[PDB]
UniProtKB/Swiss-Prot annotation:
It comes from the Eukaryota. It is a lipid-anchor. It is found in: Cytoplasm; Cell membrane; Nucleus; Mitochondrion. The modification Phosphothreonine is found at residues 36, 183, 185. This is cAMP-dependent protein kinase catalytic subunit alpha. CDD domains: STKc_PKA (cd14209). Autophosphorylated; phosphorylation is enhanced by vitamin K(2). Phosphorylated on threonine and serine residues. Phosphorylation on Thr-185 is required for full activity. Phosphorylated at Tyr-318 by activated receptor tyrosine kinases EGFR and PDGFR; this increases catalytic efficiency. Its main location: cytoplasm. Keywords: ATP-binding, cAMP, Cell membrane, Cell projection, Cilium, Cytoplasm, Cytoplasmic vesicle, Flagellum, Kinase, Lipoprotein, Membrane, Mitochondrion, Myristate, Nucleotide-binding, Nucleus, Phosphoprotein, Serine/threonine-protein kinase, Transferase. Changing residue 60 to H: Reduced interaction with SMO. GO terms for molecular function: ATP binding; cAMP-dependent protein kinase activity; magnesium ion binding; manganese ion binding; protein domain specific binding; protein kinase A regulatory subunit binding; protein kinase activity; protein kinase binding. Pfam families: Pkinase (PF00069). Its EC number is 2.7.11.11.
């Protein structure tokens, strides 16, 4: 349909930004750090405040020496380059980027509402209308990113942030990559890994539709379809499939999930012929108005309450360490783009 015009338009904007990336749009001295609020292999996300404007931001700080040692230079650069190039209603907007002698910095938009993980864990499990509202936003998110030949690869409650309006903001593009065809990297989180990733096949975008199948189950059930203590046991359960559904699951959920959690790649929804429309036109999505959810005209089933003032009460506690920038420049040749 007419949605192709939009996608044509999005391909034009992304590629101009993808070919000539925004490098060094700010510096560290322009911010005040307030609180460490995230943690990953090579850094932390910190709540900061822009001295001149007064606007709060998230600021991921990654240290070059740990990125190079662990060997994840390509992932780090992928993340930055996709983030400055993309533009979508359910994606966290990279506002600024820069680096220095020791670290890489990505100053993103402050999403006051926190992770989907916390809220899911608080109320146990979402209602199928509630899971649907979220899943709809992720279907449109993956339609956009897969148009742009981008694969996301880490879809899970923790990387989805609920904003003021109850709408999702997708963050953590560390494992995200631009590829036409297949990739061979062992990327993702165990419970979400598609069987072709586990069996070390060259996988494509269908991996993101398997991940959507696991997430919708986890939103409506309150636990993942494939779970165990050791990761090896979770991998045995995924390659077989055998997804036993909760009895409270409707027939429309059970069918959609059997199609997204389809172990055979060539028969999985979103990957076969019709594309994203196999999913858009499913009976579990019959009540979703795909344009009204895009325009954010649908009433959210959960407005996530907050402290009030830009950082007042606060949320989760982490050890506050120094943002250390050494006298000399570390690994600068490797990160010449930032
Ligand atoms: C201000 C708070 C609000 C809610 C806020 C938070 C984030 C956000 O992305 N926070 C995430 C919330 N999800 C779970 C992970 C923890 C945290 O992200 C990080 O702290 C973080 C993640 C990864 C890495 C990292 O080392 C990394 C690793 C890679 O390969 C393994 C590749 C790329 C990487 O960047 C560093 C920090 C974004 C915007 C926000 O307004």
């Amino acid at each position: 349909e007419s949605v192709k015009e939009f996608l044509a338009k999005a391909k034009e904007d992304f590629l101009k930004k993808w070919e000539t990336p925004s490098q060094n749009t700010a510096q560290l001295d322009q911010f005040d750090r307030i609180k460490t609020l995230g943690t990953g292999s090579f850094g932390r996300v910190m709540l900061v405040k822009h001295k001149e404007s007064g606007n709060h931001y998230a600021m991921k700080i990654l240290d070059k020496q740990k990125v190079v040692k662990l060997k994840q230079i390509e992932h780090t650069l992928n993340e930055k380059r996709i983030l400055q190039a993309v533009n979508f209603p359910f994606l966290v907007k990279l506002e600024f980027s820069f680096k220095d002698n020791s670290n890489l910095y990505m100053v993103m938009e402050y999403v006051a509402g926190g992770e989907m993980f916390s809220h899911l864990r608080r109320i146990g499990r979402f209602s199928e209308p509630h899971a649907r509202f979220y899943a709809a936003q992720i279907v449109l998110t993956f339609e956009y990113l897969h148009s742009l030949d981008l694969i996301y690869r880490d879809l899970k409650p923790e990387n989805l942030l609920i904003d003021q309006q109850g709408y999702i903001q997708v963050t953590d593009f560390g494992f995200a990559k631009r590829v036409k065809g297949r990739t061979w990297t062992l990327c993702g989180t165990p419970e979400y890994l598609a069987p072709e990733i586990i069996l070390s096949k060259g996988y494509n975008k269908a991996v993101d539709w398997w991940a959507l199948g696991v997430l919708i189950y986890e939103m409506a059930a309150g636990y993942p379809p494939f779970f165990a203590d050791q990761p090896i046991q979770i991998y045995e359960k995924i390659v077989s499939g055998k997804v036993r559904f909760p009895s409270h699951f409707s027939s429309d959920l059970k069918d959609l999930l059997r199609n997204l959690l389809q172990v055979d790649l060539t028969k999985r929804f979103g990957n076969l012929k019709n594309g994203v429309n196999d999913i858009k036109n499913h009976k579990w999505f019959a009540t979703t108005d795909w344009i009204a959810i895009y325009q954010r005209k649908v009433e959210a089933p959960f407005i996530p309450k907050f402290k009030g003032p830009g950082d007042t009460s606060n949320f989760d506690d982490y050890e506050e360490e120094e943002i250390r920038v050494s006298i000399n420049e570390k690994c600068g040749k490797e990160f010449t783009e930032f």
